[PDB]
């Protein structure tokens with residue numbers, strides 16, 4: 181697929197249009213700031229003078245009320261929570277917008293699941309950054325960007341795609357790479373990625389590793405540090421150089437440990453569970469369940485957030501990060517190398533087997549994980565969870581423990597015990613006397629694999645001039 185960069189895209193299609201950004205949260209603030217820095221005409225539209233109104237004023241915007249912003253808009257962007265969009269649309273947009281104004285989304289959920297039926301005489305299109313909102317901004321302001329999908333649901337001008345690409349450039353995404361997709365593909369892959377790996381999976385893997393180290397007798401501060409530091413090292417290596425590059429950066433013993441432990445901790449049953457998660461998404465069952473939860477007041481989301489914020493793991497992480505700010509395990513290596521490699525691989529391959537563009541699968545299940553893990557490293561799980569959408573919070577909370585279930589810390593424990601006893605060392609010394617056939621066989625299968633051949637091509641194009 182074509183991966184569009186800055187030199188491929190003109191801003192001219194949006195140059196003199198008034199762009200109304202509805203909402204000023206995680207994506208909304210990022211888009212508004214980025215678009216304004218890129219020279220475009222932005223107004224911020226809000227329902228209320230609340231927290232995000234105050235934030236927008238502090239950033240030099242003068243927000244308008246939603247109905248007033250949409251009256252003067254050529255392009256209307258829905259950057260409020262997915263569950264809120266129908267109500268905003270019905271009450272503040274539909275009867276107030278210019279006739280023919282563009283309707284623009286950052287996630288396909290409402291259009292794809294037919295929650296909002298747009299008018300027939302508007303362009304309807306999407307730019308979906310494959311990044312948490314704050315990193316859309318942070319990348320842009322460092323002179324870089326994050327990847328994005330664009331899609332067109334309804335073309336009435338005949339230039340909807342060019343306008344989507346222009347907006348993607350305007351928010352910095354063409355510095356990294358933009359791929360054309362569909363509302364269906366974006367929605368399905370996006371919900372899948374956040375549920376199984378980007379929010380749900382990684383969060384539960386981190387908790388499992390932390391708990392397991394603590395049960396084995398490590399002090400909490402050491403269990404936290406070992407977990408998150410090794411996670412960052414491993415995910416950074418993959419982000420830069422793929423699975424093969426990561427494996428070549430660690431010892432042969434760690435290669436063998438990673439490879440074997442990974443398939444133990446993350447086994448076929450997990451691949452089956454990922455397909456279940458995908459079908460629940462495809463069939464509309466997730467959407468119906470999320471709508472029902474939302475209409476109850478999102479009690480599951482509020483509960484989880486408040487338990488997480490108060491938890492031992494988050495208290496310990498906050499204390500650790502603060503002590504590091506102010507200046508003040510080889511089992512864990514292989515458990516994480518294995519667990520993260522096989523979770524990535526299973527997530528990516530599920531999407532590719534199901535027919536989605538492999539490039540989209542790579543942005544969603546590989547590239548974006550580095551951005552997530554950077555947020556976790558900097559701000560803890562609670563900071564990460566605050567940055568992601570409510571849809572992703574709910575998906576992660578419900579699916580994460582399905583993918584990484586209780587048994588995974590049980591398997592971790594077993595592996596950790598074999599390491600501590602010197603049993604893992606005997607086992608490495610042996611496979612080694614067979615000429616490391618398990619290691620060479622895996623390197624050989626990785627070399628030819630879709631994830632590595634696509635990743636290498638994309639990483640070359642992405643890090644071109646970034």
Ligand SMILES: NC(=O)c1ccc[n+]([C@@H]2O[C@H](COP(=O)([O-])OP(=O)(O)OC[C@H]3O[C@@H](n4cnc5c(N)ncnc54)[C@H](OP(=O)(O)O)[C@@H]3O)[C@@H](O)[C@H]2O)c1
Pocket residue numbers: 202203204205206207208226227228229230231232233258259260261262264268286287308309310311312313314567568569570571
């Ligand atoms: N978060 C991510 O990184 C991410 C990644 C890619 C795409 N997406 C997509 O981007 C879109 C926006 O998601 P987001 O997470 O950026 O949104 P968000 O941060 O949750 O949105 C908060 C904004 O929406 C307003 N809002 C909250 N409840 C509202 C209500 N009942 N009525 C009207 N306005 C309300 C808030 O105003 P107050 O301050 O007054 O409450 C605030 O301006 C979604 O389609 C999402 O799927 C998000």
Ligand SMILES: CC(C)NC(=O)C(=O)O
Pocket residue numbers: 311312313370374378379552567568569570571572
């Ligand atoms: C992981 C997260 C940033 N991605 C999303 O698509 C979202 O927040 O909904």
Ligand SMILES: [Mg+2]
Pocket residue numbers: 309310311370373374
């Ligand atoms: Mg996403």
Ligand SMILES: [Mg+2]
Pocket residue numbers: 287370371374569571572
């Ligand atoms: Mg999402």
